[PDB]
Amino acid sequence: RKLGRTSDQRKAMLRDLATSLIISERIETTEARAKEVRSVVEKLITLGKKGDLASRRNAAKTLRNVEILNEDETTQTALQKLFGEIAERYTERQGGYTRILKQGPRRGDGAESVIIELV
Amino acid sequence: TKGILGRKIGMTQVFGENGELIPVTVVEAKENVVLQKKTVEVDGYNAIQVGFEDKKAYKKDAKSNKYANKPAEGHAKKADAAPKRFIREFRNVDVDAYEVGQEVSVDTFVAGDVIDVTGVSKGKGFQGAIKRHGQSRGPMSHGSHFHRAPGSVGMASDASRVFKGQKMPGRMGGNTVTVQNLEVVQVDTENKVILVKGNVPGPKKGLVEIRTSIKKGN
Amino acid sequence: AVPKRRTSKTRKNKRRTHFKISVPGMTECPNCGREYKLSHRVCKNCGSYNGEEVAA
Amino acid sequence: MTNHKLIEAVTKSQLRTDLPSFRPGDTLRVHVRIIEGTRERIQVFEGVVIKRRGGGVSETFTVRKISSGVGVERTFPLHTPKIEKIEVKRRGKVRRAKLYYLRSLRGKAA
Amino acid sequence: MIQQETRLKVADNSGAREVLTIKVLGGSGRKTANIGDVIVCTVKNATPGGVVKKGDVVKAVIVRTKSGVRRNDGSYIKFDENACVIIRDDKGPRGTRIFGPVARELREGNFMKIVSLAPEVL
RNA sequence: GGUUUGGCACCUCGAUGUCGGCUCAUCGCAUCCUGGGGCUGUAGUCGGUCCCAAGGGUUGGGCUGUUCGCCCAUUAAAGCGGUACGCGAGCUGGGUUCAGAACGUCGUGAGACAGUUCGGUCCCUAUCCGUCGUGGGCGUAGGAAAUUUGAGAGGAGCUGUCCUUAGUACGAGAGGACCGGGAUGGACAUACCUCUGGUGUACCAGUUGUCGUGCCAACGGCAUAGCUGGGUAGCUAUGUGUGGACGGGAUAAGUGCUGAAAGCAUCUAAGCAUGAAGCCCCCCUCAAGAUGAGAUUUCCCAACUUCGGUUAUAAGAUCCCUCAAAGAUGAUGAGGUUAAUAGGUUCGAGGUGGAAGCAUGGUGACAUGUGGAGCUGACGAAUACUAAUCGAUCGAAGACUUAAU
Ligand SMILES: [Mg+2]
């Protein structure tokens, strides 16, 4: 367990970060939030290997109701993408891809920043 | 007279033969070994130098206590022994026994025997007065503002100093402790586990230390 | 509440034997030929933590 | 079960079978042993099992009678050699596992 | 746990129905009490008739406590209420009946006249 | 004696804030309880008086602003006092020393009490000392890791009931012992969560209104965590255990032995013993910055001719990083690819308590089966898939003088 913020706002912040990282496959953040969203998104790639309806009814909670995506002028929803695409790369592997890179600090707040990716 | 080391792992339930529930501590005397024998001839006191956890051989480019610096290895090669992490002594023992470099297996102990123990206490930070010492808090309402703080230190414009023995917020934890007059329940040599009535100052996987009681009644 | 006395030029300085700051970790790059800080990224050229795995 | 695998292995002996396996909401005649006055006797207690907590020897239940208008509820460790025998009679149906809604005499377990 | 200014029911043929716990005899300023512990009580109401009256003050012996006792076998017990019984240092009551069952550990304190009467020793 | 009511007017008027209570205690002994004793108009139990002794303990409530005091019910006892009638840069602010109003009164009157009464603003971000905890630097004639002695200091120090000895001793009887042994509890102090129960905001389930996911279904957001019922780890007291001891050394009051000065008697001057919870020693803890800087085991062991000295390195530790059994920060500890340190995965415990969908029975609300189902934060093993990469820093080459081989 770990605290960035209050209860609610933390949670929604994590549905947000984890909603991203798949839209973009990597982001730049402070280290702490990357650790927590790592745990989450690890659990979601563990989910999207199974692929049952119920699995969608568990990825529904955390991930958002929609966030549109276009690669080839295509319509996706960050859910179709997950169970349809992502896990189909890392089936032969366990969950637990995500890696972290202690990039550098930040002039404003002195906070360490990183580049967490699933690529 | 005797004594060993061990590790608090956990507490459980266990029944007497009259049906009396009896609480219990678990302790593990795994890999106890004697290393060195400190005579009065040289040092000025007769005692026994001991070791508990097997650790590993010399470094090559290596690092912390999982492995072993040379001098430890220089001490454990001595009596045909593997290097050990926790070393502790035991005075008040029949030093005529315990040749340098053997084991102190649980069989020295026996059910029914009485013992004390020793161990570090638990982690606790800057704790306020009433949690460190058990002082009594102050009023809530009726308008007060003195809820928890330690009260008036001292006397007056005379007796200006503040005496040393007062009671203030400092750490609460790390302390050697002893718990006289516990009893033993059982000795399972299979897992090399022992069981001790009552409860002991320790955290899980912490250090625990034992010896035969002194205040038997004599 | 307040000071009663003037804090002299000595104690104001002895008090400041600890506002120094530590020599940060440093080491040359493995194939970016320059210094950076340990268990971190280079910020250059192509990123070199074990070699390039990034652009920025 | 494992908490550490050293505790579990050595507490093995105090464990025992002859335990009717069930769920809360059971009427239950507990034929229990007693000694006092040096009289080697037994008793019998009845009622509804509120609780069943804990794994291992710590395991436990809690029963309940309403003798003489006065509520009573007793809780034993499960594996006591101070118990002789157990008899489940009925078997209940409930949407709770802990039963602390129990108060006065409209409490039909159904 | 039973203590000062605690109101209880009763069990006997008194003419009284509830009491008040002034003091909780023992040691040097005990605060508490449980099963078996004699106490010094008074009377805050009454059903009509019966020997005892309002304003009276007498001892009592606690039984039917709501945070029951731990038996050394590792078994516990819990009632719902609190109660007491009136007494005269015969360690035998005034009353003629006992409603409301009893807790047995009274027996260690050598009380048997009320244990003769109680459904049931429990 | 200098705790009271007083006398004095020596500090204080460019401010020394006063009563009482809360938290905190600390001390004296002219002892309130326990311990030991002497005397007795002490038969015994209970007692009265005097002596030694301050090691510990010395309660809840009613009543008033209350010291005081009366009372209830307990208790072994419910001490007397000092510390700005302890403590307000720690708290209260009920009376009293502000303004309003009013009652009796005195005054021709404004207004004032010998008084009474309803109400009435309490600031201070701690520089120094002191104190509680805790890290750096240097030193202890080379450098390191471990263990440990313990001059000193601190802490603990309380006590009832009951069975027996013995219904014996004692006394006519009523009544009713020392001594000693034995179990059992109060309060207090420490340690812990296996139990009892508490909390437990990324666990579980039910559920009200509303908005959204294009709709039904199933979900999410918000509303004190929206409320309600449970509740793992962890933290916890009312829970769980444990403890004060036993014992010895020297002692005061006191009791003696031998014995003179003083042929006797004489406890004392020469001498010998004896004797309290008191002193000390033992019990728990800290502790070599005890500058008297300790002792033991083990380890590292060059080249440069400045001769004195210099060097990058050796053993080792750190910088850096993952993390808790530790944590305000720093420190301590587990660990760093020649690896299970943390995460994740797979198992498991425990917890919640019958997922979704599907079918079936229902006009439906809903039930049954599929199924001790699904879910699961901290707990337990295994699993290198990811993250502790490559690396740099610091650190000796052992002064002299005697006396030893
Ligand atoms: Mg009243």
Ligand SMILES: [Mg+2]
């Ligand atoms: Mg619990």
